[PDB]
Amino acid sequence: MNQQKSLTLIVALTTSYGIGRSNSLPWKLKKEISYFKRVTSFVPTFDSFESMNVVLMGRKTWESIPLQFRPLKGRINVVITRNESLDLGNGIHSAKSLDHALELLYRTYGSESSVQINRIFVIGGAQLYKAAMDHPKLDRIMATIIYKDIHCDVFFPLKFRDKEWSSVWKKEKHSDLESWVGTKVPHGKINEDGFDYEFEMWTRDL
Numbered sequence: 001m002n003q004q005k006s007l008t009l010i011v012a013l014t015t016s017y018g019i020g021r022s023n024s025l026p027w028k029l030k031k032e033i034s035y036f037k038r039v040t041s042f043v044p045t046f047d048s049f050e051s052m053n054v055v056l057m058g059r060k061t062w063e064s065i066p067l068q069f070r071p072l073k074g075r076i077n078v079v080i081t082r083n084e085s086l087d088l089g090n091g092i093h094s095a096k097s098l099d100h101a102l103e104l105l106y107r108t109y110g111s112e113s114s115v116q117i118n119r120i121f122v123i124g125g126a127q128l129y130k131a132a133m134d135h136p137k138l139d140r141i142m143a144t145i146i147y148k149d150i151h152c153d154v155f156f157p158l159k160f161r162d163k164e165w166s167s168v169w170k171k172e173k174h175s176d177l178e179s180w181v182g183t184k185v186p187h188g189k190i191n192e193d194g195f196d197y198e199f200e201m202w203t204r205d206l
């Protein structure tokens with residue numbers, strides 16, 4: 001009664017797997033953020049009469065997001081921390097692990113509940129990505145690849161794009177990405193603020 005849905009990890013990362021610096025993002029990309037918001041918010045039309053997606057994040061990511069933007073609108077937010085607590089929150093879910101979060105969500109958002117869960121996303125940071133990478137239900141990574149070795153002080157924990165991991169993690173066709181996300185997605189390099197980046201989707205068999 002706990003393992004009824006796959007997890008999807010969503011991340012923007014450099015070719016050196018860098019994801020962060022000074023507890024924030026070391027880039028400023030409005031369209032990249034708009035993609036994150038669209039992907040994490042998208043529910044197919046028939047289902048969206050009551051469906052909401054879930055965003056799971058570590059406490060340091062929670063704090064990283066400008067207070068203006070919290071909780072992340074229109075999604076069920078859960079902050080994962082070893083130390084309960086709160087973080088001061090208006091409706092704001094807390095759990096001590098990825099599986100305690102899932103248990104809390106299934107208990108809270110049941111068959112009878114007016115709000116139902118569509119997809120569940122792990123949205124960072126490195127420590128929670130590490131847990132998700134070890135979780136037997138994670139099967140999908142929505143990666144934005146940033147083609148610049150921007151200096152970072154926190155890194156994605158497993159080199160899923162590299163040869164050593166290439167029998168396990170496979171990059172999907174762009175048409176498959178678009179299908180999964182429910183919309184046209186720009187394909188190939190996008191330039192904002194002096195860097196090229198591009199959207200990818202990678203999967204692992206369960």
Ligand SMILES: NC(=O)C1=CN([C@@H]2O[C@H](COP(=O)(O)OP(=O)(O)OC[C@H]3O[C@@H](n4cnc5c(N)ncnc54)[C@@H](OP(=O)(O)O)[C@@H]3O)[C@@H](O)[C@H]2O)C=CC1
Nearest residue numbers: 011012020024058059060061081082124125126127128131
């Ligand atoms: N580029 C990208 O897409 C993203 C980048 N980032 C960046 O990542 C950096 C944050 O990464 P990181 O420092 O690893 O922080 P995280 O957000 O993963 O938070 C780490 C903390 O969250 C809790 N936590 C995480 N995993 C677990 C677990 N398995 N069980 C229990 N508690 C857990 C904290 O708990 P406790 O309260 O016990 O200390 C732990 O210290 C920042 O620079 C942020 O900007 C974040 C999201 C996306």
Ligand SMILES: CCOC(=O)CCCOc1ccc(OC)c(Cc2cnc3nc(N)nc(N)c3c2C)c1
Nearest residue numbers: 010011012025033036037061064065069123124144
């Ligand atoms: C009205 C604007 O819509 C908004 O709500 C975004 C405003 C917040 O600005 C941010 C500053 C820092 C930050 O690091 C946590 C994030 C989170 C983020 C950004 N890109 C991201 N991009 C990807 N591919 N993946 C992520 N997981 C991600 C994540 C978590 C956002």
